[PDB]
């Protein structure tokens, strides 16, 4: 059904205000430490943990925003290479990210953590645009 895509689009647009709440759940990423990363990744990447809430919210914006620029920025964040693995994939367990973080040296964890702090600065910009679209 072509109307099935219309309904899906309507639903995704309806989810926009909700992605903002998901981005709120991602705030601890700004102060995540390399030790915390190793220790908490499985929690951060499951349920509504910060990394999974981040991935899910960004995907919602990428698919539900009616502003092309916001869709592009969300897509760019999701594909951003974090330690060599796309940010999107950091929001799940049982995959490449879980393995990488398990075998990570102190230096790699530091690099990953710093990249995550940097991502949160860009999230602020994307959020400003989305809050504007929602209002």
């Amino acid at each position: 059904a072509s109307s099935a895509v219309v309904f899906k689009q309507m639903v995704l647009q309806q989810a926009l205000p909700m992605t903002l709440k998901g981005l709120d759940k991602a705030s601890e990423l700004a102060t995540l430490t390399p030790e915390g990363l190793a220790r908490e990744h499985s929690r951060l990447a499951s349920g509504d943990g910060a990394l999974r809430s981040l991935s899910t919210a960004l995907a919602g914006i990428r698919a539900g925003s009616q502003v092309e620029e916001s869709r592009i920025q969300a897509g760019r964040l999701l594909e951003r290479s974090i330690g060599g693995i796309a940010l999107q994939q950091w929001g799940t367990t049982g995959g490449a990210a879980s393995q990488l973080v398990l075998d990570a040296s102190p230096e790699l964890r530091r690099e990953i953590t710093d990249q995550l702090h940097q991502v949160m600065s860009e999230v602020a910009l994307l959020r400003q645009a989305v809050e504007s679209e929602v209002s």
Partner: protein
């Protein structure tokens, strides 16, 4: 061909999307795709009868609680999922999923599905859970929960190895 609408709910990361993709495409997802809302379909034969199965994938995070009910109208059967290696997701079947489904659809049949079956025998997974003073959910626990919430069936499956996967949907279909 009968059209059957099946909606899948449960905590984020229990494996709803992997389970649905593994079944509809016959291959475990190559990468993780966050779910806010999506739907897939499959033409299957159950007991010699052709069926157009409509599958609805949802977001398990509470932030999307207001969105999930939009997938519920005219649902034929619900799959409530929890990860067999996540006791917390199992407890939520009772605390959240069963109540939500029943509140919206009091007469719709429910299949309780335990996911990631392959991990219950996985050494590293068992070890990591022990460090947190946890242990995987056993078949008996799941069966008891199914009876507690009135599920028509309790089934376990692995989207990865596909063990028990086909049965989940044959039974979902047979429940309608």
């Amino acid at each position: 061909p009968q059209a059957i609408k099946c909606v899948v709910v449960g905590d984020g990361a229990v494996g709803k999307t992997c389970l649905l993709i593994s079944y509809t495409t016959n291959a475990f997802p190559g990468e993780y795709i966050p779910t806010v809302f999506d739907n897939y379909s499959a033409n299957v034969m159950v007991d010699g009868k052709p069926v157009n199965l409509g599958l609805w994938d949802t977001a398990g995070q509470e932030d999307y609680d207001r969105l999930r009910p939009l997938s519920y109208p005219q649902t034929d059967v619900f799959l409530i999922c929890f990860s067999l290696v996540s006791p917390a997701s199992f407890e939520n079947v009772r605390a959240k999923w069963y109540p939500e489904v029943r509140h919206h659809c009091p007469n719709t049949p429910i299949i309780l599905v335990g996911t990631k079956l392959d991990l219950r025998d996985d050494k590293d997974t068992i070890e990591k859970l022990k460090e947190k003073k946890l242990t995987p959910i056993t078949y008996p626990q799941g069966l008891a929960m199914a009876k507690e919430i009135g599920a028509v069936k309790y089934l376990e499956c692995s989207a990865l190895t596909q063990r028990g996967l086909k049965t989940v949907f044959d039974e979902a279909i047979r429940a309608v």
